[PDB]
Amino acid sequence: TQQPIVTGTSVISMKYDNGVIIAADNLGSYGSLLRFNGVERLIPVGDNTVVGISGDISDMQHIERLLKDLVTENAYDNPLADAEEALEPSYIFEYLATVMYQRRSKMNPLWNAIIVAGVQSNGDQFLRYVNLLGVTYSSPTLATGFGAHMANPLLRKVVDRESDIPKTTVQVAEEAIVNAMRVLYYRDARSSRNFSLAIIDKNTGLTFKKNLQVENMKWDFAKDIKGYGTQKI
Amino acid sequence: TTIVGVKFNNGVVIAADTRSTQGPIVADKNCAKLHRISPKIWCAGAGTAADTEAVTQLIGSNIELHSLYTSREPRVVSALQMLKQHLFKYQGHIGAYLIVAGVDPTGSHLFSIHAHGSTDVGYYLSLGSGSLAAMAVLESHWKQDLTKEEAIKLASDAIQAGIWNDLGSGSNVDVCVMEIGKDAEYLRNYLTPNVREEKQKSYKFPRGTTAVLKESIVNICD
Amino acid sequence: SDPSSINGGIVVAMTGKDCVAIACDLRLGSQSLGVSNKFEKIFHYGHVFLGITGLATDVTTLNEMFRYKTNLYKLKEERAIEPETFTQLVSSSLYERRFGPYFVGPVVAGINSKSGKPFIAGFDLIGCIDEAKDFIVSGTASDQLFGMCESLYEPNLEPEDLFETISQALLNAADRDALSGWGAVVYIIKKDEVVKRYLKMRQD
Amino acid sequence: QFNPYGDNGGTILGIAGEDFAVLAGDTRNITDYSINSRYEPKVFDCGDNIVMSANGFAADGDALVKRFKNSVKWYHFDHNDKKLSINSAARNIQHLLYGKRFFPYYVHTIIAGLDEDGKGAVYSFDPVGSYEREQCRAGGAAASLIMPFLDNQVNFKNQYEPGTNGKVKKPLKYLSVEEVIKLVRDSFTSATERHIQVGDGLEILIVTKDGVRKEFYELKRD
Amino acid sequence: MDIILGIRVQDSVILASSKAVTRGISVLKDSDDKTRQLSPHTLMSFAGEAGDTVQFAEYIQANIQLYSIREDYELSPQAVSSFVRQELAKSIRSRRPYQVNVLIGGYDKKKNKPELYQIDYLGTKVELPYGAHGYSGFYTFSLLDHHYRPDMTTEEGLDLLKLCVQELEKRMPMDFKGVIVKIVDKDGIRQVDDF
Amino acid sequence: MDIILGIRVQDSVILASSKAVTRGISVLKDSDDKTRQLSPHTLMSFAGEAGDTVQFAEYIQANIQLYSIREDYELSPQAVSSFVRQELAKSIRSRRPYQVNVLIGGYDKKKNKPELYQIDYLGTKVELPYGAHGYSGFYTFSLLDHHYRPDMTTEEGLDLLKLCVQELEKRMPMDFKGVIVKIVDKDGIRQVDDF
Amino acid sequence: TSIMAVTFKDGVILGADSRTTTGAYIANRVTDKLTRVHDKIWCCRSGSAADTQAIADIVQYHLELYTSQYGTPSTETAASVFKELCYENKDNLTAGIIVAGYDDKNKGEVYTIPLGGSVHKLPYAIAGSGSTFIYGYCDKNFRENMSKEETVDFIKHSLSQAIKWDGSSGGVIRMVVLTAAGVERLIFYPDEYEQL
Amino acid sequence: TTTLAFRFQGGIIVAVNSRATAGNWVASQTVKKVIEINPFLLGTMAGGAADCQFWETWLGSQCRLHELREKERISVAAASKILSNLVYQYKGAGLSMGTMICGYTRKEGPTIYYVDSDGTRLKGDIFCVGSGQTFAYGVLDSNYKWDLSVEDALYLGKRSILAAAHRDAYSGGSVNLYHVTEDGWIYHGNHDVGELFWKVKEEEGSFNNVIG
Amino acid sequence: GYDRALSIFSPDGHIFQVEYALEAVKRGTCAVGVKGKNCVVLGCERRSTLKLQDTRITPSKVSKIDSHVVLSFSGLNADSRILIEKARVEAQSHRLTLEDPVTVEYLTRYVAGVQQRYTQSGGVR
Ligand SMILES: *[C@@](C)(CO)[C@](*)(O)[C@H](CC(C)C)NC(=O)[C@H](Cc1ccccc1)NC(=O)[C@H](CC(C)C)NC(=O)[C@H](CCc1ccccc1)NC(=O)CN1CCOCC1
Ligand SMILES: *[C@@](C)(CO)[C@](*)(O)[C@H](CC(C)C)NC(=O)[C@H](Cc1ccccc1)NC(=O)[C@H](CC(C)C)NC(=O)[C@H](CCc1ccccc1)NC(=O)CN1CCOCC1
Ligand SMILES: *[C@@](C)(CO)[C@](*)(O)[C@H](CC(C)C)NC(=O)[C@H](Cc1ccccc1)NC(=O)[C@H](CC(C)C)NC(=O)[C@H](CCc1ccccc1)NC(=O)CN1CCOCC1
Ligand SMILES: [Cl-]
Ligand SMILES: [Mg+2]
Ligand SMILES: [Mg+2]
Ligand SMILES: [Mg+2]
Ligand SMILES: [Mg+2]
């Protein structure tokens, strides 16, 4: 039995024609206090996988260590560690999914929601979700927390089903992700303006973008809003 | 429910889905959530279904009597004031969440009211279980100086986001356009994107399938 | 101690071509104990029919109340109340007890004598009106009835065919509910004749 | 306090014919009022002509299916590649479920296949391992909507022979794979209309002596 | 208060009511009459919460007797039962409801028919051929379903009633100290002294 | 399980134990023997939680019988009672305690004296001239205080016991379906078949 | 909420963020928490939106009726009416109100009214959830008889920090200037105040 | 549930219903509540479905192991005590079982043992177990005699379940009959209440409360 | 714990420890069992090199396992007590679970099983 202390909010992601995009803001909240501002919640594993984590940050840092150790363990007695027998996104996910469910079954969960985004060896896009309960699911778009309520609706307008994936370019996909991050900044009280974004492409590989900011915001209309009903001044 | 309100050039537009739930069960697949308070003041309602209907009819009645008494067309702020003071008096127990909109001699207006009696002003608003899906669309596509046709499109798109992504919302899209100097047009079932497909089989029974014990003619006349 | 599921029971109403049908089971129990197999849940005031499920004391109380109100209506108006008007009266009366409600699930059914239009409606316990073209359901086996009606129903059924559809909807729903059954009654309502049929069903 | 269970919604349906058996299930996965996935399969080919689905709390469902699939694998190793009969699989699943009697798998499990005489078989389980062979079973969120319809259409309950005074029952007979798939599709379209947790897609797995075939159909996405 | 039964036969209504009054681990009395005569051809038995039962029964009795004097006329069993139901229906939504269950046995002189009504504390009225309140029903109803016929005599009804009491005495946990039996017919109300 | 009594007289110990076994609103059995013979001259009656009672009684029985075989010798009632008390004294601080109350009636062959011990589920032992467990005591103790004499015969003890059962049958709420009476003396244990 | 009112040489300035929340969801990101109860008597609202609106509406009614009979009310009088409502209904209210007004005799005055319904006259006041994070800053930086531009910078920098650390505060920074000249509304957007 | 079994002149009658409920939801109408342990032993099931089904099939395995080890069929007493000692170990854990172990052996003769999940184990001639046990008792007790014929005894057991199936909401479906003799148990068919009620009503003239 | 395998096979296929245990039996005082038509009789030798014995209290050679079964023996006296104790406990345990006393075959089978367990358990002779 836990309660989460220092927390991270939404992680959002989607598939596009050649790969996957994933994003998450750099905030570590302490209840209503926006305590920590330099927190990286996207963690790359190799050059083909990115694990995005929301929820308890102490448990996130534990998972970081496990993934770090997983890379080391895989390299042991493995001449093809950087080739055929390298870590796949599906391997990394199933490992985490096993841990998450084992921990919930011991009534001592890792208080997180996790999205494993990556590209398989055969070029296939990988995007799957797992949380503190051990529940897993996959979809063209995946999001955690407030992202599930606000980002998914926007991202599903671009990729509504499987057949929309080949029709979606990396430019269009990233534009939707960046827009979703702005909407979350408007409406999620535990979000920040600063965020990170990662693209895993089957051709161009892993591109990790840090220190992005929400921009092109609409606030001007606020000056016209006066009172809460009758008030004219 | 998903309900929205959007201001435009010469007026205001409100919209709503048409699903009514009873737990996880869909009770009414095509209920009307847009309510007429006065001819040019309309109301979208979310929350407890009986409460939204009852509170909107009561204030609508009192607005009519007020309009006759003062020899004036009713104002949106009057409906707003009367609704919020009623709801506040009952401390949230009347579970009515409303988007109030309309045109009057002062101009065009758009407000929201919550069950506890707080009111908000805005150019675009959304209430209900699918308000987050709708607000995501409104935040992405809204701009200043919308036309009539652009506002209807934006409003219906916001409702659609709720229909598809929120389990609490579904079925059709109702719309009401309130433009200054014109009659308000109530567009019942403006979109119907959830038509039931043809069934695979007819379940019309052969006559006599049901076993009967007694028959009798009922007297309805005097 | 859930008022709506102590006594048990179900009501269902359907529309057809120039006709309406309303049906109900006959069980009245006290939780597991079956007490009566003659407890009818459908009443009528003139040509307007009202079915009521839920707590039996409120079913009886409301029947007596609406008989009271429709009798005064007729004396002052000098005409029989219509289904559309009666529906509003039911809603008003239920919402009057908003914070101390009757634990019931009423269902109005009838044909408007002026226009000839078939009309059905349903309510929750505090008076919210649920109007429908096709069918209305109510009671402890409402989930079962919703499933049966949604699959079996088709529009513009003749009175004789409509009878079979509504009966099969009620019977099979009642057999999947422990607190419903013990007999059934079906009212077929045409413009100026009404037939009442008792159904044969399993008595467990 | 940490709650180890959740409700992922969805519904499943198993029907048995003379020389075949179907196990259907919608592809929607949900939590509360949100959609997680519009296509997340929960009906699985487990080998030896046994199809399985464990609907309810998906994490427990996936764990169970995973463990049964593994049980089949070890049954081959330990007993000279002997085919696991459907009745033996059912008993094995009881022990898997009851093994966690005091911390249950929150799932309704259904398996389908052919018995040792080549005839269609459907077995259904409660969360703690009580099981029974049946011609017909619906499980999950919309089970209460679908099941009475199946009683009426598959087992011909409450249907009497016309003109026989409700004395002669409608005779039982096996349905064709074509007629069964019609009932499955109509059951799910009806459930989709009236239950919020059911929709998006329908995936049917058909089991004959030749093998395991699949069929997919679209469902309403609201 | 515990066991009250009622059987309507061809020409009469028979009410049987337990004699025991228990408080704690002591049977304070074993000869209690759990009934009141509402009118010459109407009898009401009762069971439920202590104090409430008698207070309610006597309140009803007084009201019916007041009516009889005012109109110089006896109310029908149906009319009396409807009056009683309404009082309980008011009661259930009061500050402190009457927790009383009743059976009303009466002979309608205009129809020349016996009538038995069962009304619980919520105000739930049903006319029945045979009725019971409390745990008694869980034994007697199934027994009467089997042995009861509509055309039985008063003597056959008493034998049918003896069969119920015997079953209760065998399978009921508590000792209810037997029953007082009363018959309601065209000649009014009378008590069976040897049961 | 409810009523168990015990009376020590001049030359014997008499144990009376109710026959009823009730679960819910149903008397499942009316001929239950709530006692076990621990040895030829020692008898233990029991009452308490369902399942625990018989499981405990038989566990004690087996242990005493094991002792008798090992030593080819019968343990004294005092020794058996001390053994039983210790087992209950261990039990009360266990994860799940035995909720069983017992009376141990025995005839000590070395002393040529009857002995009655009352032990509750906590392991509280007392030697008494007369004893009871449960609500029975609240009637019988005062009755025995009055009528009991230490020099009574077995026949006088049975009449004294009949007086207790009659009082219980009059004032107890529950129907306990009479009692099985057993006598323990110099000649061993025997049952009174007509009570 | 983060709200504050600051007296200065020419009068008084009220300041507030624009965020309204339901849990962690922002129900309104452009809220106006600065509200007029009289020509030159305004108030900052914190706590329950419903309660504070209901109170402010009643006060506005009382002061309008006061003006019809006895002429312009004092800022103290306004604070007394607020207090009376907040104190007498303390069991059913969640309202943290700052009252600020400009007289010609008394110049700028600020009264703060916390949950209990007590009244406190101060040179400047801060309130709302986000005020906790700026007690240190405001105490160190506040000076009496500041200029208009200095007071605007003081409020802007203060609420900027409150907004930065408090999740329950954000959006635009609204301000209302009360002087002999009249009533002036000011607004400041994220792009400006965030990078202070 | 409703289950019964009584002892009489011609051996043992055992009768049970076939309904399974999850609250007010009728889950099944075709459940086998009698377990066939061996040609001479039967077990009835009431309470938790899984608990009963799992542990009584387990009981059968323990009875098989007894006759392998001892070269002799297990006694009814020994069989019932294996089950009662098992559920007693789980006492307080939340098992829900109301079972009756019925059978014949040479040394015992026809024997019925009531065994429930709180550890109670009782030998007796008549037992009714389940949510509708009281309704079955009412009919069974009032018509029971030791000198009943095999034909009349089978009917009384069937009629008693029917009485409970009718009145108890959580009982119904169909009646399963068994007759246990010196030669072993004999199955006497599945009887649907749908047809059985009206057949009994018409022929017997009972159930006058119901609209005919 | 002491684990040593004391009872083991030898090249010729014998377990010497078991065979040497038989030599201890051969040393012990003679015991005889004869069963008639309606009875069994157990005779036992007692060596007469021990005078000044107290026959009241000296352990008897024949031991009751239950009221209906008896056990006599030959060999090490101390060892016999352990078997008799185990047999007596099993006798009461059988009455408790089966509600019937042991058969003579069952009791023998149990005792024999104990003796066997000590021929292939580590640390014991
Ligand atoms: C979306 C769908 C969700 O927010 C919308 O907001 C809509 C609003 C439209 C319809 C105006 N909300 C609903 O439809 C609303 C959701 C809801 C459910 C429960 C409580 C509050 C809100 N649905 C209802 O209000 C239904 C309407 C029926 C289908 C006509 N009503 C019920 O579910 C009632 C609840 C009444 C109630 C009383 C007191 C406090 C709150 C609600 N439930 C029942 O009647 C159930 N049952 C009937 C018989 O008696 C036993 C209980
Ligand atoms: C900052 C945010 C904190 O100090 C400010 O003070 C602002 C003040 C501005 C608006 C004047 N405060 C709020 O925005 C205020 C926070 C709050 C919440 C609850 C009690 C006191 C203060 N927010 C509200 O009042 C919102 C306004 C609605 C969204 C328009 N209302 C609610 O949160 C309602 C009110 C319930 C309530 C509780 C206690 C006292 C009065 C009212 N709450 C809900 O609807 C709860 N909701 C249930 C469903 O799940 C999500 C939460
Ligand atoms: C009469 C017929 C009814 O009382 C009998 O007493 C029968 C005995 C027969 C079945 C052997 N008892 C039942 O029918 C019994 C009643 C019951 C229910 C729950 C607990 C104890 C007793 N029913 C069951 O056991 C059902 C069997 C169904 C029909 C498959 N199962 C459940 O109720 C299950 C598992 C219960 C459970 C016990 C202990 C721990 C966890 C679970 N529960 C669910 O299915 C839960 N639920 C049902 C609806 O779907 C959503 C989830
Ligand atoms: Cl506000
Ligand atoms: Mg039923
Ligand atoms: Mg749906
Ligand atoms: Mg902020
Ligand atoms: Mg029933």
Ligand 1 pocket member B129 (CB < 6 A): yes
Query: C25 alpha carbon to ligand 5 midpoint, in Å?
Result: 10
Query: What span, in angstroms and rounded, lies between the C-alpha atoms of C191 and D211?
Result: 57
Closest CB to E145 among H134, H141, H163? H163
Q: Which residues contact F18 (CB under 8 A, 6 or more apart)?
A: F1, F2, F3, F4, F32, F34, F176, F177, F178, F179
Give the containing element (helix H, strand E) for E146.
Answer: helix E137-147
**Resolution, angstroms, 1 dp:** 2.9
**Tokens coding A88:** 């796949």
Closest approach atom of ligand 1 to CA C130: 30
- Quick check: helix, strand or coil at residue D194? helix
Q: Which residues contact I118 (CB under 8 A, 6 or more apart)?
A: I7, I124, I125
**Tokens coding B167:** 């389990």
Smallest CA–CA distance, residue A197 to chain G, in Å, is 22
Query: What span, in angstroms and rounded, lies between the C-alpha atoms of A140 and D37?
Result: 8
Task: Report CA E168 to chain centroid distance, whole Å.
Answer: 17
φ/ψ (deg, to 5) at C4: -70, -15
Query: What span, in angstroms and rounded, lies between the C-alpha atoms of D53 and D43?
Result: 5
- C-beta atoms of B122 and G30 within 8 A: yes
Query: What span, in angstroms and rounded, lies between the C-alpha atoms of A130 and A89?
Result: 13
Looking at domain B1-222, its CATH architecture is: 4-Layer Sandwich (3.60)
β-bridge mates for residue G184, sequence order = G177
**Tokens coding G183:** 């009533």
| Residue-range definition of the domain harbouring residue E35 | 1-195
The neighbour count for residue H128, using CB atoms within 10 Å, is 30
Alpha-helical runs (H) found in chain A: 57-75, 89-105, 146-156, 170-187
Q: How does DSSP assign chain G, residue by residue?
A: --EEEEE-SSEEEEEE---EEETTEEEESS---EEEEETTEEEEEEE-HHHHHHHHHHHHHHHHHHHHHH-SPPHHHHHHHHHHHHHHTGGG--EEEEEEEE-SSS-EEEEEE-TT---EEESEEEESGGGGGGHHHHHHH--TT--HHHHHHHHHHHHHHHHHHBTT--S-EEEEEEESS-EEEEEE-HHHHTT-
- C-beta atoms of G166 and A233 within 8 A: no
Question: Chains meeting G at 3+ CB pairs closer than 8 A?
Answer: A, B
What helix, strand, coil percent values describe chain F, rounded to 5?
A: 35, 35, 30
Domains of chain G in start order, with CATH, are 1-196 (3.60.20.10)
The neighbour count for residue G68, using CB atoms within 10 Å, is 8
Give CA angle at D54 (D97, D198), nearest 5°.
Answer: 145
Q: Which residues surround ligand 8, an ion (CB under 5 A)?
A: C 204; H 169, 172
Structural contact between residues B42 and B29, judged by C-beta atoms closer than 8 angstroms: no
Mutation test residue for ligand 2: of G22, G89, G174, the one with most atoms within 8 Å of CB:
G22
Residues of F in contact with I96 (CB under 8 A): 58-59, 62
- C-beta atoms of I96 and F59 within 8 A: yes
**Tokens coding A159:** 């990729």
Closest CB to G168 among A32, A146, A228? A32
Is beta strand G34-38 parallel, antiparallel or unpaired with respect to H25-28?
unpaired
Smallest CA–CA distance, residue D201 to chain B, in Å, is 14
- Quick check: helix, strand or coil at residue C203? coil
Report yes or no: C146 at the B interface, CB cutoff 8 Å: yes
Domains of chain C in start order, with CATH, are 1-204 (3.60.20.10)
The tally of CA atoms less than 13 A away on the side-chain side of residue B130 is 30
**Tokens coding E81:** 């039962």
Structural contact between residues B79 and B38, judged by C-beta atoms closer than 8 angstroms: yes
Binding residues of H for bortezomib: 49
Query: G160 alpha carbon to ligand 7 midpoint, in Å?
Result: 9
Smallest CA–CA distance, residue H154 to chain F, in Å, is 22
Structural contact between residues G174 and G33, judged by C-beta atoms closer than 8 angstroms: yes
Amino acid at E2: D
Domains of chain A in start order, with CATH, are 1-233 (3.60.20.10)
β-bridge mates for residue I44, sequence order = I31
Query: What span, in angstroms and rounded, lies between the C-alpha atoms of C177 and H170?
Result: 9
Structural contact between residues B11 and B178, judged by C-beta atoms closer than 8 angstroms: yes
**Tokens coding A70:** 């997983």
The neighbour count for residue A206, using CB atoms within 10 Å, is 17
> Residue with structure tokens 């009442």?
C196
Q: Which of residues 93-152 of D touch B (CB under 8 A)?
A: 141
Query: What span, in angstroms and rounded, lies between the C-alpha atoms of A49 and A43?
Result: 9
Smallest CA–CA distance, residue D68 to chain A, in Å, is 16
Q: Which of A154, A160, A216 to mutate to test the interface with B (most CBs of B within 10 A)?
A: A154
For residue E123, give the nearest of E95, E104, E110 by alpha carbon.
E104
| Atom 30 (ligand 3) nearest CA | D126
> Residue with structure tokens 């108890």?
H168
Structural contact between residues A72 and A99, judged by C-beta atoms closer than 8 angstroms: no
Ligand 3 pocket member H193 (CB < 6 A): no
Name the interface residues of E facing H (CB cutoff 8 Å): 128-130, 138-150, 163, 166-167, 170-171
For residue A11, give the nearest of A203, A165, A191, A168 by alpha carbon.
A191
Alpha-helical runs (H) found in E51-136: 52-71, 77-91
Number of domains comprising chain F: 1
Q: Which residues contact C98 (CB under 8 A, 6 or more apart)?
A: B50, B54, B94, C126, C127
Query: G132 alpha carbon to ligand 7 midpoint, in Å?
Result: 14
Q: How does DSSP assign D23-62, residue by residue?
A: EEEE--EEETTEEEES-----EE-STTEEEEEEESHHHHH
**Tokens coding C113:** 């004598």
* Protein fold of D1-222: Glutamine Phosphoribosylpyrophosphate, subunit 1, domain 1 (3.60.20)
Any idea what the CATH number is for the domain that residue F14 is in?
A: 3.60.20.10
Rg of chain C in Å (alpha carbons):
16
Q: In what order do the strands lie in the sheet with B185-191?
A: B124-128, B2-8, B11-17, B173-179, B185-191
Query: What span, in angstroms and rounded, lies between the C-alpha atoms of B25 and I11?
Result: 81
Structural contact between residues F15 and F161, judged by C-beta atoms closer than 8 angstroms: no
Any idea what the CATH number is for the domain that residue H29 is in?
A: 3.60.20.10
φ/ψ (deg, to 5) at H176: -110, 125
Question: Chains meeting D at 3+ CB pairs closer than 8 A?
Answer: A, B, C, H
Amino acid at C199: L
Closest approach atom of ligand 1 to CA C53: 49
Report yes or no: D178 at the B interface, CB cutoff 8 Å: no
Query: What span, in angstroms and rounded, lies between the C-alpha atoms of H152 and G98?
Result: 90
Give CA angle at H4 (H1, H6), nearest 5°.
Answer: 175
> Residue with structure tokens 């039911």?
C90
User: In Å, what is the CA distance from A191 to each residue of A114, A195, E164?
Assistant: 17, 9, 73
Q: Which of residues 165-204 of H touch I (CB under 8 A)?
A: none
Is beta strand F188-192 parallel, antiparallel or unpaired with respect to F179-185?
antiparallel
Give CA angle at G101 (G95, G104), nearest 5°.
Answer: 165
The tally of CA atoms less than 13 A away on the side-chain side of residue A78 is 14
Ligand 1 pocket member B58 (CB < 6 A): no
Residues of H in contact with C183 (CB under 8 A): 210-211
Ligand 2 pocket member G174 (CB < 6 A): no
Ligand 2 pocket member G92 (CB < 6 A): no
Rg of chain E in Å (alpha carbons):
16
Residues of B in contact with H212 (CB under 8 A): 213
Ligand 3 pocket member H206 (CB < 6 A): no
- C138-151 as b/e: b if 16+ CB within 10 A: bbbbbbbbbbbbbb
Give the containing element (helix H, strand E) for E125.
Answer: strand E125-127
Give CA angle at F39 (F34, F45), nearest 5°.
Answer: 20
